[PDB]
Scaffold this active site. Structure first.
Site, short mmCIF file in Angstrom:
data_model
loop_
_atom_site.label_atom_id
_atom_site.label_comp_id
_atom_site.label_asym_id
_atom_site.label_seq_id
_atom_site.Cartn_x
_atom_site.Cartn_y
_atom_site.Cartn_z
N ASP A 256 0.93 10.65 -13.45
CA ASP A 256 1.63 9.46 -12.96
C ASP A 256 0.83 8.21 -13.36
O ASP A 256 -0.27 7.97 -12.88
CB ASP A 256 1.72 9.56 -11.46
CG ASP A 256 2.50 8.43 -10.81
OD1 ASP A 256 3.09 7.57 -11.50
OD2 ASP A 256 2.54 8.38 -9.57
N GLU B 280 0.27 4.89 -12.90
CA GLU B 280 0.30 3.73 -12.04
C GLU B 280 -1.13 3.38 -11.67
O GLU B 280 -2.01 4.28 -11.63
CB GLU B 280 1.19 3.93 -10.79
CG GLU B 280 1.41 2.58 -10.00
CD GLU B 280 2.51 2.54 -8.94
OE1 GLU B 280 3.09 3.59 -8.62
OE2 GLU B 280 2.80 1.40 -8.44
#
Length: 435
Positions: free
Chosen positions: A271, A273
């Site tokens: 992920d 982020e």
């Protein structure tokens, strides 16, 4: 060019050169398919055989240690002769894998298959085109998460800062099956190691407690057939999952595979982020790009070919379909999308690798796994439904969002929970009485 008829081998059901097979019953059937770059001639022919010598080559290339699956348990129809279909530029033979006794539990075995005795009109460019491989796991005793052949499967993230992943076991159908096929420990981080001058895996104490205590807090899930993945997430420095150079990605993938081996886990979720801008002077880093993200996924799969490489389609994590001539279906096993959308395939992937719904169980977005939604997802050919951040304190809402869909997907609705777990505690508590 006109006379170059290049052949390669792949699994006929999945179209993958490297295919993980889970044995849920006594027999597993598929085909082995030889692809041709040109229309066959009249005399075109080939066979396949198990090629044990290639396993040495494969293990060296991947830095792996797979044992050879017992050859007597593998049968090719027609002593391995491929039936050539002129009109589809391909040839195939049925292969049956029988489960055996005496294999070691929780071990991946290999079936390396080679083209053999090919006719003179066929060219095979290298040993990698000449072979395909099956990576076989015996799941016969670990069936509680297996809800049937080809059913939709569940993908669940736990915020392990707050919630014990043993709560996976709170989610069963009325027939006893476990709802969530795959769970993610969200999340370990990528961070800069200034002393080493490169990124490293960095685990907060909550992630580290689970890993240190994996025999009591993670392995029980795996014994019942749940795949447990380590989540990786950016974390506010110059490093990130979509900004590693080729070398940076190779080194980081090596560490991720080390974690998955050391703690006996089933793969990773990436992920992208929370990372900041990279230091472009650092040889481990590069301009942030979906191309860099793809490189990392490719290198990770190379380091752990029998494990799942999965991505949250967010940031710059997903979208580039090929790395070093290898298509994404070989190195993205599952992609899940943001709340309110269904994921999509790239390259030669299919919707079977994609989530049809993503539910944020803590914050509320993404909809519900209703009977109607279940059927809509089936009609769309989606393989997965995703959930994020369940907690025992919110089981009323969570389970409300799961009503109706189970009967459609599995022939059995999700049952109301009777057990929950507290953070870092192996004790099964009664739900709701012990809350």
């Amino acid at each position: 060019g006109i006379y170059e008829n290049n052949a390669y081998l792949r699994d006929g059901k999945s179209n993958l050169v490297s295919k993980v097979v889970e044995l849920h019953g006594e027999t597993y059937a598929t085909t082995v398919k030889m692809g041709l770059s040109k229309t066959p001639n009249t005399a075109t022919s080939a066979k396949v055989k198990i090629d044990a010598a290639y396993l040495e080559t494969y293990n060296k290339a991947h830095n792996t240690d797979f044992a050879l699956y017992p050859q007597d348990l593998v049968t090719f129809a027609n002593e391995g002769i491929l039936t050539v279909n002129a009109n589809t530029k391909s040839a195939e033979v049925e292969m049956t894998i029988r489960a055996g006794e005496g294999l070691q539990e929780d071990k991946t075995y290999a079936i390396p298959v080679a083209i053999s005795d090919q006719s003179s009109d066929i060219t095979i460019k290298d040993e990698d085109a000449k072979h395909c491989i099956y990576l076989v796991k015996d799941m016969r005793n670990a069936g509680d998460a297996y809800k049937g052949e080809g059913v939709m499967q569940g993908y669940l993230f736990f915020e392990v800062n707050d919630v014990n992943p043993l709560n996976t076991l709170s989610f069963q159908l009325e027939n006893g099956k476990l709802l969530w096929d795959v769970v993610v420990l969200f999340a370990a981080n990528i961070n800069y190691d200034a002393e080493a001058g490169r990124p490293r895996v960095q685990c907060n104490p909550n992630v580290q407690y689970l890993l240190d205590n994996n025999e009591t807090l993670l392995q029980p899930l795996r014994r019942r057939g749940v795949k447990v993945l380590l989540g990786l997430l950016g974390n506010h420095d110059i490093t990130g999952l979509a900004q590693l150079s080729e070398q940076g990605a190779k080194d980081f993938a090596r560490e991720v595979a080390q974690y998955c081996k050391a703690y006996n886990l089933d793969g990773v979720n990436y992920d992208d982020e929370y990372s900041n801008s990279p230091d472009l002077s650092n040889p481990s880093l590069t301009n942030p790009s979906t191309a860099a993200a793809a490189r990392l996924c490719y290198e990770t799969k190379q380091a752990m070919p029998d494990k799942l490489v999965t991505v949250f389609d967010w940031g710059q994590m997903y979208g580039v379909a090929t790395v070093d001539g290898v298509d994404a279906k070989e190195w993205i096993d599952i992609v899940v999308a943001n709340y309110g959308s269904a994921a999509y395939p790239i390259g030669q992937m299919t919707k079977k690798q994609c989530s049809g719904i993503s539910m944020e169980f803590n914050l509320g977005g993404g909809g519900s796994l209703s009977a109607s939604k279940a059927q809509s997802m089936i009609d769309g050919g989606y393989g997965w439904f995703m959930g994020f951040a369940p907690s025992p304190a919110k089981y009323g809402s969570v389970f409300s969002r799961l009503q109706g869909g189970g009967e459609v997907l599995y022939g059995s609705n999700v049952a109301a929970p009777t057990i929950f777990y507290k953070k870092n505690d192996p004790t099964p508590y009664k739900y709701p009485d012990d809350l």
